[PDB]
Short mmCIF file of C-alpha atoms and ligand atoms in Angstrom, two decimals:
data_model
loop_
_atom_site.label_atom_id
_atom_site.label_comp_id
_atom_site.label_asym_id
_atom_site.label_seq_id
_atom_site.Cartn_x
_atom_site.Cartn_y
_atom_site.Cartn_z
CA UNK A 1 161.69 -140.61 -13.23
CA UNK A 2 160.01 -144.16 -12.79
CA UNK A 3 155.97 -143.72 -12.07
CA UNK A 4 155.64 -145.45 -9.18
CA UNK A 5 158.10 -143.83 -7.29
CA UNK A 6 155.81 -141.30 -7.72
CA UNK A 7 154.97 -140.12 -3.63
CA UNK A 8 151.06 -139.15 -2.80
CA UNK A 9 151.49 -135.34 -1.46
CA UNK A 10 153.56 -134.72 -4.75
CA UNK A 11 150.52 -136.90 -6.74
CA UNK A 12 148.25 -134.01 -4.32
CA UNK A 13 150.26 -130.61 -4.22
CA UNK A 14 150.95 -131.46 -8.52
CA UNK A 15 146.89 -131.88 -8.75
CA UNK A 16 145.45 -129.11 -6.71
CA UNK A 17 148.13 -126.78 -8.85
CA UNK A 18 146.22 -128.30 -11.71
CA UNK A 19 142.40 -127.20 -10.37
CA UNK A 20 143.54 -123.85 -9.56
CA UNK A 21 144.55 -122.87 -12.23
CA UNK A 22 142.40 -124.97 -15.41
CA UNK A 23 140.03 -125.95 -13.28
CA UNK A 24 138.23 -129.51 -12.38
CA UNK A 25 137.04 -130.07 -16.12
CA UNK A 26 139.91 -129.32 -18.02
CA UNK A 27 142.30 -131.14 -15.87
CA UNK A 28 143.32 -134.49 -16.68
CA UNK A 29 145.48 -137.49 -15.19
CA UNK A 30 147.90 -136.69 -18.07
CA UNK A 31 148.15 -133.00 -16.93
CA UNK A 32 148.79 -133.71 -13.37
CA UNK A 33 151.22 -137.06 -13.93
CA UNK A 34 153.35 -133.82 -16.15
CA UNK A 35 152.87 -131.12 -13.75
CA UNK A 36 154.35 -134.01 -10.86
CA UNK A 37 157.56 -134.94 -13.30
CA UNK A 38 156.10 -138.14 -14.11
CA UNK A 39 153.08 -139.73 -16.60
CA UNK A 40 150.00 -140.33 -15.90
CA UNK A 41 150.88 -143.55 -14.28
CA UNK A 42 152.37 -141.84 -11.33
CA UNK A 43 148.59 -140.66 -11.01
CA UNK A 44 147.23 -144.51 -11.00
CA UNK A 45 150.10 -145.62 -8.75
CA UNK A 46 147.81 -144.22 -6.04
CA UNK A 47 144.54 -142.81 -6.95
CA UNK A 48 141.58 -144.58 -9.76
CA UNK A 49 140.94 -141.88 -11.38
CA UNK A 50 140.84 -137.78 -11.11
CA UNK A 51 137.80 -137.66 -8.89
CA UNK A 52 139.67 -139.68 -6.15
CA UNK A 53 142.34 -137.48 -6.54
CA UNK A 54 139.88 -134.39 -5.95
CA UNK A 55 138.38 -136.15 -3.05
CA UNK A 56 141.64 -136.44 -1.54
CA UNK A 57 142.77 -133.08 -2.16
CA UNK A 58 139.68 -131.97 -0.23
CA UNK A 59 140.40 -134.50 2.79
CA UNK A 60 143.54 -133.00 3.51
CA UNK A 61 142.00 -129.15 4.14
CA UNK A 62 138.67 -130.48 5.18
CA UNK A 63 139.76 -133.55 7.85
CA UNK A 64 141.68 -130.82 9.98
CA UNK A 65 139.18 -127.87 10.24
CA UNK A 66 136.92 -130.16 10.85
CA UNK A 67 138.89 -131.49 14.19
CA UNK A 68 139.40 -127.61 15.24
CA UNK A 69 135.30 -127.63 15.07
CA UNK A 70 134.90 -130.55 17.28
CA UNK A 71 136.92 -129.47 19.74
CA UNK A 72 134.71 -126.85 20.60
CA UNK A 73 132.36 -128.44 21.89
CA UNK A 74 134.80 -130.14 24.78
CA UNK A 75 133.18 -131.06 28.48
CA UNK A 76 137.01 -130.07 29.84
CA UNK A 77 136.36 -126.09 28.98
CA UNK A 78 133.44 -123.80 29.59
CA UNK A 79 133.64 -121.02 26.66
CA UNK A 80 132.72 -122.91 23.81
CA UNK A 81 131.40 -119.82 21.78
CA UNK A 82 134.54 -118.28 22.04
CA UNK A 83 136.22 -121.19 21.45
CA UNK A 84 134.00 -121.69 17.90
CA UNK A 85 134.82 -117.70 17.18
CA UNK A 86 138.79 -118.88 17.87
CA UNK A 87 138.47 -121.40 15.79
CA UNK A 88 136.20 -119.59 12.61
CA UNK A 89 138.26 -116.21 12.94
CA UNK A 90 142.32 -117.62 12.48
CA UNK A 91 140.35 -120.01 9.69
CA UNK A 92 139.09 -116.35 7.96
CA UNK A 93 142.11 -115.12 8.71
CA UNK A 94 144.27 -118.26 7.01
CA UNK A 95 142.18 -118.37 4.32
CA UNK A 96 143.27 -114.89 3.50
CA UNK A 97 146.87 -115.15 4.01
CA UNK A 98 147.23 -118.41 2.61
CA UNK A 99 146.24 -118.60 -1.09
CA UNK A 100 146.97 -121.99 -1.69
CA UNK A 101 144.30 -123.06 0.98
CA UNK A 102 141.83 -120.27 -0.85
CA UNK A 103 142.06 -121.70 -3.68
CA UNK A 104 141.19 -124.66 -2.53
CA UNK A 105 138.53 -123.77 -0.74
CA UNK A 106 137.87 -121.99 -4.20
CA UNK A 107 137.19 -125.23 -6.05
CA UNK A 108 134.95 -126.94 -3.49
CA UNK A 109 132.67 -123.26 -3.81
CA UNK A 110 132.62 -123.54 -7.58
CA UNK A 111 131.43 -126.56 -7.40
CA UNK A 112 129.92 -128.86 -10.56
CA UNK A 113 130.18 -126.24 -13.83
CA UNK A 114 126.32 -128.23 -15.06
CA UNK A 115 123.80 -130.94 -14.05
CA UNK A 116 125.86 -133.33 -15.69
CA UNK A 117 127.91 -133.83 -13.22
CA UNK A 118 127.06 -133.80 -9.22
CA UNK A 119 130.85 -134.77 -8.18
CA UNK A 120 132.02 -131.61 -6.29
CA UNK A 121 128.34 -131.33 -5.07
CA UNK A 122 127.85 -134.80 -2.84
CA UNK A 123 131.87 -134.00 -1.05
CA UNK A 124 130.19 -130.24 -0.37
CA UNK A 125 126.36 -131.70 0.52
CA UNK A 126 128.77 -134.35 2.97
CA UNK A 127 131.37 -131.41 3.95
CA UNK A 128 128.36 -129.03 5.16
CA UNK A 129 126.83 -131.68 7.12
CA UNK A 130 129.87 -132.35 9.21
CA UNK A 131 130.49 -128.50 9.78
CA UNK A 132 126.79 -127.94 10.94
CA UNK A 133 126.76 -130.88 13.08
CA UNK A 134 129.92 -129.52 14.78
CA UNK A 135 128.84 -126.33 15.34
CA UNK A 136 125.85 -127.65 16.63
CA UNK A 137 126.84 -129.41 19.35
CA UNK A 138 129.68 -126.25 20.83
CA UNK A 139 125.64 -124.14 20.73
CA UNK A 140 124.52 -127.26 22.73
CA UNK A 141 127.04 -127.00 25.39
CA UNK A 142 126.76 -123.03 25.32
CA UNK A 143 123.29 -123.34 26.27
CA UNK A 144 123.99 -125.75 29.37
CA UNK A 145 125.98 -123.35 30.34
CA UNK A 146 123.21 -120.53 30.15
CA UNK A 147 124.70 -118.34 27.50
CA UNK A 148 122.66 -118.21 24.82
CA UNK A 149 119.80 -116.68 24.81
CA UNK A 150 116.24 -117.84 26.21
CA UNK A 151 114.93 -119.71 23.65
CA UNK A 152 117.86 -120.18 21.44
CA UNK A 153 117.55 -123.19 19.09
CA UNK A 154 121.14 -124.60 18.86
CA UNK A 155 120.31 -126.42 15.35
CA UNK A 156 118.59 -123.00 13.79
CA UNK A 157 121.76 -121.44 15.36
CA UNK A 158 124.09 -123.51 13.33
CA UNK A 159 121.98 -122.82 10.05
CA UNK A 160 122.20 -119.34 10.41
CA UNK A 161 125.99 -119.30 10.80
CA UNK A 162 126.63 -121.43 8.43
CA UNK A 163 124.53 -119.77 5.90
CA UNK A 164 125.99 -116.35 6.84
CA UNK A 165 129.55 -117.62 6.26
CA UNK A 166 129.15 -119.12 3.78
CA UNK A 167 127.47 -116.20 1.92
CA UNK A 168 130.66 -114.05 2.98
CA UNK A 169 132.93 -116.59 0.84
CA UNK A 170 131.15 -116.85 -1.90
CA UNK A 171 131.20 -113.07 -1.87
CA UNK A 172 135.06 -112.30 -1.39
CA UNK A 173 135.22 -115.21 -3.84
CA UNK A 174 133.84 -113.04 -6.79
CA UNK A 175 134.53 -109.86 -5.45
CA UNK A 176 137.52 -109.44 -2.94
CA UNK A 177 137.76 -105.65 -3.01
CA UNK A 178 134.06 -105.69 -2.08
CA UNK A 179 133.73 -108.61 0.33
CA UNK A 180 136.51 -109.22 2.65
CA UNK A 181 137.46 -112.70 4.37
CA UNK A 182 138.56 -111.60 7.45
CA UNK A 183 136.73 -108.04 8.01
CA UNK A 184 133.15 -109.65 7.00
CA UNK A 185 133.46 -113.03 7.86
CA UNK A 186 133.73 -111.99 11.58
CA UNK A 187 131.45 -109.51 10.89
CA UNK A 188 128.88 -111.86 9.94
CA UNK A 189 129.98 -114.45 12.81
CA UNK A 190 129.71 -112.14 15.86
CA UNK A 191 126.60 -110.53 13.99
CA UNK A 192 125.04 -114.42 13.89
CA UNK A 193 126.19 -115.08 17.13
CA UNK A 194 124.69 -112.02 18.72
CA UNK A 195 121.42 -113.43 17.61
CA UNK A 196 121.81 -116.54 19.51
CA UNK A 197 124.24 -115.53 22.08
CA UNK A 198 123.72 -113.35 25.78
CA UNK A 199 125.49 -110.17 25.45
CA UNK A 200 128.35 -110.10 27.22
CA UNK A 201 129.32 -113.73 27.02
CA UNK A 202 131.68 -112.28 24.17
CA UNK A 203 133.36 -109.24 22.96
CA UNK A 204 132.22 -108.33 19.33
CA UNK A 205 135.47 -107.78 16.81
CA UNK A 206 138.23 -109.19 19.36
CA UNK A 207 140.85 -111.25 18.05
CA UNK A 208 140.74 -114.32 19.81
CA UNK A 209 143.81 -115.80 21.01
CA UNK A 210 144.61 -119.59 18.71
CA UNK A 211 142.49 -122.22 20.32
CA UNK A 212 145.26 -123.97 22.34
CA UNK A 213 146.91 -127.65 21.33
CA UNK B 1 112.92 -109.69 -29.95
CA UNK B 2 111.30 -112.62 -30.36
CA UNK B 3 113.59 -114.83 -31.70
CA UNK B 4 115.86 -113.35 -29.17
CA UNK B 5 113.53 -114.68 -26.45
CA UNK B 6 113.63 -118.08 -28.40
CA UNK B 7 117.39 -118.22 -28.57
CA UNK B 8 117.75 -116.83 -24.75
CA UNK B 9 115.00 -120.04 -23.82
CA UNK B 10 116.74 -122.70 -25.99
CA UNK B 11 119.99 -121.22 -24.21
CA UNK B 12 118.94 -121.63 -20.93
CA UNK B 13 118.68 -125.30 -21.34
CA UNK B 14 121.70 -125.78 -22.75
CA UNK B 15 123.26 -123.67 -20.31
CA UNK B 16 121.43 -125.52 -17.09
CA UNK B 17 122.19 -128.72 -18.10
CA UNK B 18 125.89 -128.80 -20.06
CA UNK B 19 127.31 -125.90 -18.48
CA UNK B 20 128.94 -122.84 -19.88
CA UNK B 21 132.57 -124.54 -21.07
CA UNK B 22 130.13 -126.83 -23.30
CA UNK B 23 127.76 -125.06 -24.77
CA UNK B 24 128.34 -123.47 -28.39
CA UNK B 25 125.70 -121.28 -30.51
CA UNK B 26 125.36 -124.23 -32.40
CA UNK B 27 123.85 -126.21 -29.87
CA UNK B 28 121.51 -123.83 -29.07
CA UNK B 29 120.63 -122.37 -32.53
CA UNK B 30 119.19 -126.72 -33.13
CA UNK B 31 116.65 -126.27 -29.51
CA UNK B 32 115.48 -123.46 -30.62
CA UNK B 33 114.52 -124.87 -33.63
CA UNK B 34 116.43 -122.00 -35.33
CA UNK B 35 119.48 -121.75 -38.66
CA UNK B 36 123.09 -120.31 -37.97
CA UNK B 37 122.61 -117.10 -39.49
CA UNK B 38 119.45 -116.48 -37.30
CA UNK B 39 120.86 -117.27 -34.45
CA UNK B 40 124.61 -114.18 -35.20
CA UNK B 41 122.19 -111.48 -35.89
CA UNK B 42 121.40 -111.54 -32.16
CA UNK B 43 124.39 -112.96 -30.52
CA UNK B 44 127.92 -113.57 -32.17
CA UNK B 45 129.13 -115.58 -29.11
CA UNK B 46 128.43 -117.32 -26.38
CA UNK B 47 128.71 -114.86 -24.11
CA UNK B 48 126.74 -112.22 -25.65
CA UNK B 49 124.49 -114.99 -25.28
CA UNK B 50 125.01 -115.45 -21.46
CA UNK B 51 124.82 -111.86 -20.57
CA UNK B 52 121.20 -112.02 -22.46
CA UNK B 53 120.22 -113.95 -20.11
CA UNK B 54 121.88 -113.35 -16.20
CA UNK B 55 120.48 -109.80 -17.93
CA UNK B 56 116.36 -110.93 -18.50
CA UNK B 57 116.35 -112.08 -14.79
CA UNK B 58 118.88 -109.51 -13.36
CA UNK B 59 117.09 -106.59 -14.64
CA UNK B 60 114.06 -106.23 -13.40
CA UNK B 61 115.18 -107.82 -9.61
CA UNK B 62 117.37 -104.51 -9.45
CA UNK B 63 114.30 -102.87 -10.64
CA UNK B 64 112.62 -104.01 -7.80
CA UNK B 65 115.59 -103.39 -5.24
CA UNK B 66 115.60 -99.75 -6.71
CA UNK B 67 112.82 -99.14 -5.95
CA UNK B 68 112.89 -99.70 -2.12
CA UNK B 69 114.61 -96.65 -1.96
CA UNK B 70 111.96 -94.46 -3.16
CA UNK B 71 111.83 -90.65 -1.93
CA UNK B 72 108.25 -91.67 -1.90
CA UNK B 73 107.40 -93.86 0.33
CA UNK B 74 108.55 -93.91 4.11
CA UNK B 75 109.30 -97.75 4.83
CA UNK B 76 112.28 -98.35 3.20
CA UNK B 77 113.12 -101.70 5.40
CA UNK B 78 109.96 -103.14 4.92
CA UNK B 79 109.60 -102.58 1.18
CA UNK B 80 113.45 -104.38 1.05
CA UNK B 81 112.54 -107.24 3.15
CA UNK B 82 109.17 -107.50 0.98
CA UNK B 83 111.46 -107.93 -1.96
CA UNK B 84 113.85 -110.11 -1.05
CA UNK B 85 111.19 -112.41 0.42
CA UNK B 86 108.99 -112.42 -2.48
CA UNK B 87 112.08 -113.35 -4.75
CA UNK B 88 112.66 -116.11 -2.49
CA UNK B 89 109.64 -117.41 -2.50
CA UNK B 90 109.19 -117.02 -6.24
CA UNK B 91 112.64 -118.99 -6.71
CA UNK B 92 111.45 -121.79 -4.17
CA UNK B 93 107.74 -122.25 -6.44
CA UNK B 94 109.35 -121.60 -10.33
CA UNK B 95 111.87 -124.78 -11.30
CA UNK B 96 112.19 -122.08 -14.76
CA UNK B 97 113.73 -119.17 -12.38
CA UNK B 98 115.46 -121.18 -10.11
CA UNK B 99 117.67 -123.05 -13.12
CA UNK B 100 118.23 -119.42 -14.54
CA UNK B 101 119.38 -118.45 -11.37
CA UNK B 102 121.43 -121.33 -10.51
CA UNK B 103 123.37 -120.60 -14.18
CA UNK B 104 123.82 -117.34 -12.71
CA UNK B 105 125.29 -118.26 -9.20
CA UNK B 106 127.60 -120.72 -10.72
CA UNK B 107 131.47 -120.30 -10.61
CA UNK B 108 133.98 -120.54 -13.74
CA UNK B 109 135.27 -123.20 -13.56
CA UNK B 110 139.25 -121.54 -13.60
CA UNK B 111 140.68 -118.39 -12.60
CA UNK B 112 141.79 -118.11 -16.83
CA UNK B 113 137.83 -117.83 -17.73
CA UNK B 114 136.24 -114.73 -16.28
CA UNK B 115 133.45 -113.11 -19.03
CA UNK B 116 130.58 -114.72 -16.29
CA UNK B 117 132.51 -113.68 -13.14
CA UNK B 118 132.58 -110.34 -14.95
CA UNK B 119 129.22 -109.80 -14.78
CA UNK B 120 128.78 -111.69 -11.14
CA UNK B 121 130.91 -108.92 -10.02
CA UNK B 122 128.61 -106.35 -11.86
CA UNK B 123 125.75 -108.08 -10.59
CA UNK B 124 126.99 -108.33 -7.19
CA UNK B 125 127.89 -104.46 -7.12
CA UNK B 126 124.39 -103.46 -8.42
CA UNK B 127 122.84 -105.42 -5.86
CA UNK B 128 124.68 -104.12 -3.00
CA UNK B 129 124.58 -100.49 -4.18
CA UNK B 130 120.84 -100.68 -4.57
CA UNK B 131 120.37 -102.61 -1.01
CA UNK B 132 122.19 -99.65 0.82
CA UNK B 133 120.31 -96.88 -0.77
CA UNK B 134 117.63 -98.31 0.65
CA UNK B 135 119.35 -98.71 4.17
CA UNK B 136 120.79 -95.35 3.42
CA UNK B 137 116.98 -94.27 3.07
CA UNK B 138 116.16 -95.82 6.50
CA UNK B 139 118.85 -94.56 7.97
CA UNK B 140 117.65 -91.07 7.29
CA UNK B 141 113.92 -92.12 8.32
CA UNK B 142 115.57 -93.22 11.88
CA UNK B 143 114.42 -96.75 11.09
CA UNK B 144 118.27 -98.64 11.95
CA UNK B 145 119.55 -98.84 15.14
CA UNK B 146 122.30 -96.12 16.79
CA UNK B 147 125.42 -96.29 15.01
CA UNK B 148 124.03 -98.87 12.69
CA UNK B 149 126.26 -97.98 9.63
CA UNK B 150 124.40 -98.59 6.43
CA UNK B 151 127.14 -99.52 4.11
CA UNK B 152 127.65 -102.39 6.51
CA UNK B 153 124.27 -103.66 6.72
CA UNK B 154 123.97 -103.49 3.46
CA UNK B 155 127.16 -105.94 3.43
CA UNK B 156 125.72 -108.43 5.50
CA UNK B 157 122.40 -108.34 4.12
CA UNK B 158 124.07 -109.34 1.19
CA UNK B 159 126.04 -111.81 2.35
CA UNK B 160 123.07 -113.50 4.07
CA UNK B 161 121.37 -113.66 0.96
CA UNK B 162 124.08 -115.39 -1.03
CA UNK B 163 124.64 -117.85 2.14
CA UNK B 164 120.62 -118.73 1.68
CA UNK B 165 120.88 -119.27 -2.08
CA UNK B 166 124.17 -121.27 -2.29
CA UNK B 167 123.16 -123.33 0.88
CA UNK B 168 120.18 -124.49 -0.92
CA UNK B 169 121.31 -125.12 -3.84
CA UNK B 170 123.66 -127.66 -3.00
CA UNK B 171 121.28 -128.89 0.21
CA UNK B 172 117.64 -128.17 -0.81
CA UNK B 173 116.70 -130.11 2.30
CA UNK B 174 118.99 -128.70 4.10
CA UNK B 175 118.40 -125.44 3.26
CA UNK B 176 115.16 -124.48 2.68
CA UNK B 177 114.35 -120.97 0.63
CA UNK B 178 111.49 -120.05 2.12
CA UNK B 179 111.91 -120.91 5.80
CA UNK B 180 115.64 -120.71 6.33
CA UNK B 181 115.79 -117.39 3.86
CA UNK B 182 112.85 -115.76 6.00
CA UNK B 183 114.30 -116.33 9.34
CA UNK B 184 118.15 -115.55 7.89
CA UNK B 185 116.89 -112.19 6.48
CA UNK B 186 114.72 -111.08 9.79
CA UNK B 187 118.06 -112.13 12.34
CA UNK B 188 120.88 -110.13 9.80
CA UNK B 189 117.73 -106.99 9.42
CA UNK B 190 117.21 -106.88 13.23
CA UNK B 191 120.60 -106.67 14.10
CA UNK B 192 120.69 -102.84 11.69
CA UNK B 193 116.99 -101.98 12.25
CA UNK B 194 114.76 -101.14 15.08
CA UNK B 195 112.64 -103.11 16.55
CA UNK B 196 108.45 -102.53 15.46
CA UNK B 197 109.98 -101.20 12.41
CA UNK B 198 108.87 -104.79 9.93
CA UNK B 199 106.69 -107.26 11.09
CA UNK B 200 109.39 -110.69 11.14
CA UNK B 201 108.13 -113.98 10.67
CA UNK B 202 105.64 -113.64 8.23
CA UNK B 203 105.12 -112.72 4.45
CA UNK B 204 104.58 -109.16 3.78
CA UNK B 205 101.86 -108.05 1.35
CA UNK B 206 102.61 -107.85 -2.45
CA UNK B 207 104.74 -103.49 -3.33
CA UNK B 208 102.38 -101.72 -5.29
CA UNK B 209 103.54 -100.92 -9.44
O1 TCL C 1 136.18 -128.36 5.42
C1 TCL C 1 136.37 -127.72 3.84
C2 TCL C 1 135.32 -129.18 3.35
C3 TCL C 1 135.34 -128.74 1.87
CL1 TCL C 1 133.90 -129.93 0.81
C4 TCL C 1 136.65 -127.87 1.51
C5 TCL C 1 137.19 -127.37 1.88
C6 TCL C 1 136.94 -126.76 3.02
O2 TCL C 1 138.34 -125.97 4.23
C7 TCL C 1 137.62 -125.37 4.76
C8 TCL C 1 136.25 -124.68 4.58
C9 TCL C 1 135.87 -123.54 5.32
C10 TCL C 1 136.33 -122.87 6.30
CL2 TCL C 1 135.75 -121.26 6.83
C11 TCL C 1 137.96 -123.19 6.46
C12 TCL C 1 138.71 -124.63 5.91
CL3 TCL C 1 140.58 -124.97 6.44
O1 TCL C 2 129.32 -124.81 6.19
C1 TCL C 2 130.33 -124.14 6.77
C2 TCL C 2 129.90 -123.37 7.62
C3 TCL C 2 130.46 -122.42 8.56
CL1 TCL C 2 130.21 -121.18 9.90
C4 TCL C 2 132.15 -122.60 8.53
C5 TCL C 2 132.56 -123.99 7.88
C6 TCL C 2 131.60 -124.58 6.90
O2 TCL C 2 132.04 -125.65 5.93
C7 TCL C 2 132.01 -125.28 4.94
C8 TCL C 2 132.36 -124.45 4.17
C9 TCL C 2 132.72 -123.82 2.87
C10 TCL C 2 133.40 -124.80 2.07
CL2 TCL C 2 133.19 -124.90 0.38
C11 TCL C 2 133.44 -126.48 2.65
C12 TCL C 2 132.91 -126.14 3.85
CL3 TCL C 2 132.76 -127.85 4.70
#
C-alpha cells in the first residue's frame, strides 16, 4: 500500500466517512489517509490540504444536483413547474433513503463551528447562489407559459422556495421525529409553489415521475 | 445572579469567536475577569454554561410565543405574526442578540457530540408546540382556512422561520431578515389563514404587557 497508489475516489470516500463521524474540525490528513488504507502522503497525492478535500466531497454531490435543476428551465419542455417538483421531490426521497448523501448534505448544513473560519460558509454561499439562479430560471420559463399568478416575481418566488426548503432540511437534521424530510419537503415545496403558481397547473401532494434522461 | 450574568456575557464572546469545542471554562473566566473558583460556583462545565446562554434568550422568546395563544385575546394569528416580525426586526438591529442566536443555531460538528443538539431539539419542540397552540386557538375562532390542520400549519411556520434565519446567517445580503422574513411569514400564514385576518406587508404594533 504505497501512497501513490491511492485513487482520488478512495481518498474522498474515506474522507467523507471521517467528516461524518468526527466532523470537519477533528478530521486530519493522517486520519483520512489511515482510513483509506494508506498514510497522509496518499491524500497529498491528490489534494493540497483538507479544505480542497472538503470542496471535492461537496462538488461530487452538488454538481449532479445543479445539473438536474438546470434542466427544469429547458425550452424543450413546457412543464417547468412540474419538472422543478420532479427534481426536488426525488431529491428529498433520495436524501431520506441514502444516509451517505444525507450525511454529506448535513456536513454542509452544519457549517463552520465558529466565526474563526468561514471555509464551509463560502461553499454554502456559492451553492445557495447556484441553486437560486437555477430555480429562478425555471420560474421565469413558467411565467412566459402563463403558469404563474398575475404579478408573481420569479426571483422572489425562488428566494421563498429556498427559504422554506432550507428550513425543512435544518429541522429534519435537528429532529427527524418532528420534521420529515420527504413529507415536509413536499409540503413546503407545494405550499410555496401554490403562492406563486396558478391553480390547476400541478396537483399538490402527488409524486412526480423522475425527470427523464 | 450578576456574576452569573458576567460569566455568560464573556462566554458569549468566546463561544462566537472560538466555537463550542475550543472554548473552556478557564478562557471564559479570564475575559470575564474572575477566578476559576468563582466560575465553577455557577457552572461546573461548558454545557451548563451554554444551557444558561441559550436559556437567557430562548426563554423569554417562548414566553412571547406562549402569550399569542392566551384565551384572553381573540387575535392569535395577528399576535403570533407580530411576535415573529418583531423578533426578526430585533435580530437584524442588535448584533449582540444576533451572535447569541447564531451560537444557538450552529450545529454540533459531529454525530458524536450532542448536548447542544439536545437543547436545539428541546428548543425546536418548545417553539413548535407554542406555534401550534396559537394556531389551534385561531382554528377555534374561525380564522384558519377550511380543513387547515394547526399541527401542519405550525410545522410549515417553523420551517419558514428556520429557513429565513439560516438563509440570513450564510448570506446576509441575499436573505434580508426584516424584508424577506416578513415576505416568507406572510406567504406561509396566507396558506393556512383566511384573508382579512391580519394585514400583510406591515409591521404590526407592539403586543401589550
Ligand atoms: O448542492 C449541494 C450543495 C452543498 Cl454546499 C452541499 C450538498 C449539496 O447537495 C444537495 C443539496 C440539497 C438538496 Cl435538496 C439535494 C442535494 Cl444532492
Ligand atoms: O438553497 C437551496 C434551495 C433549494 Cl429549494 C434546494 C437546494 C438548495 O441548495 C442547497 C441546499 C442545502 C445545502 Cl447544504 C446546499 C445547497 Cl446548494
